[model samples]
Target: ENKHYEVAKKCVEDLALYLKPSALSRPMQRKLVTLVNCQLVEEEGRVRAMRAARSLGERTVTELILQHQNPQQLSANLWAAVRARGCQFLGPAMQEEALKLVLLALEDGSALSRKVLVLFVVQRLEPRFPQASKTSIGHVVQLLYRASCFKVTKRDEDSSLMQLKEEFRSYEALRREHDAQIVHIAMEAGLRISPEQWSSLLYGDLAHKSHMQSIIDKLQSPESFAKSVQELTIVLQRTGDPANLNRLRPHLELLANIDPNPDAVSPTWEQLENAMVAVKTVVHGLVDFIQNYS
Candidate 1:
């Protein structure tokens, strides 16, 4: 196995030698594909290539794939490496490097590269691996927000457009979650709180707040209603990660019976819709952050 690995390493080494910036096109591309494919086997060659990378210069040992053509080639090479190398030597540093190149390929690579590499990677990893997905996403958002290169001016109209786009997505996610909870309670239980009442419960006093202390007291109330709402606020601060949601059952259930008189205070469908819209309006910043390329 080591021997096969050794051979693969040699192949990659030879390929890289040809793949360097100085190398001309056709042969360089061919060698790159070959080397990348060599990495697929569980052998020493791929490992050797990785170990060799340990000593290589970040600048000298790698090519900056800026052109559309190079990224297409790079994507092919990267996929080969992924299949060949597995995660054996693909540590965080490697992941960082891969993220840099992949983002470039997705946005600027050749048509073939975008069709195969960009779409495939995004479809598989975007919705699933938050860590990896966010790694690239923040960068993209930053790029779009800036509307040019690196300098982002918040005062510009284009920046506002980007901000709105970011907010729309963020609000959509928050709105969906909030809507689900509201609908579930309204449909399953006989309790109804108007959007006005719910907002007051969450932000102001349980009733109308005459003063700031009244607001504080309502928020800190020892009753199930106050405590449950507080818990929801805490979970929201943690970005609604499901890990945090697991501990929220007690607080969530406090709303099961909701109000004492469900018949008298039922939330109209319009009220619920209005609440979702209002929450969405408030979540634009979070969305902007989330949509940014990491």
Candidate 2:
């Protein structure tokens, strides 16, 4: 029953060894995506071919996202190919569909290279934004914001994202158990606050400015900044409420106060930072205009 993957893996491995990147046309490349999509190609081989495709250095990256059926490996591969060469190559309906699939991959418990999943969405998912489907988009955005917090720790290794499956029963206990001790420790060490804690802090009797500072620090950190702003854009666009801005303004001011100059943020960070500011400005303008509508 299970003899197939290793055997298929071997063939694909051999294939990548001699594969010429530029030689494959778009249709031919989809043939490989089809093999992986339908399960004829296994992991080690898929990874190898993915690398070889990138050596061609451009086309297959967006092609995979457009043509591939599943999000896991394609998004994972695109995540690895952080170069922007034809990244946003989606037509209208396709862009909407691609947006849905990538966001689905992000909030799912499945393994994804989340750094670029966030990047892909922030850059490509929208100005084609949530008018795609407002309610579902809002729910998924919050889930990423919430689940990727203190409850589930971030593992900084490629091996971590290649998970065949997740260890769930083990997490069930701690996932349910919320300890202020987690907040205290994470606040000291730098981690996201649980939404419950954020809500309680914002609305409950507890008066703490530090949580606001802490959240903005985490949101604006090089690791979380771009993704969190993407989430913020979705939330604001969904509600068109000034209250969201009220809660967000202090964080914006705080983010401004401690801005990392263009010098400090580099590589993808610089590109994404400028893109996020543009997105922020547009979203802010849209929300303001909508509220003022007669």
Compared with the true structure, what per-residue lDDT tens digits does model 2 show for residues 203-266? Answer: 3534444544454454444323434444455545765745434344343333333333433422
* Cα deviation of 193, candidate 2, in Å: 5.0
- Residue lDDT tens for model 1, 1-294: 345434434434443543445433453354334334533344343333232222121111111111102334533443343233221112333333433444444333222222244344455554534455432534333322222222222444432211122322332332333223332333234222333443443234354333323333433332343443444455456555433333433323322223433243533333322322222222222223234422
Best-matching candidate per TM-score = 2
- Candidate 2: stretches off by over 4 Å: 1-203, 211-223, 232-294
TM, every model? 0.14, 0.19
Best by lDDT: 2
Question: Can you tell me which runs of candidate 1 are displaced by over 4 Å?
Answer: 1-95, 106-109, 113-115, 118-294
Report the C-alpha displacement of residue 145, candidate 1, in angstroms: 18
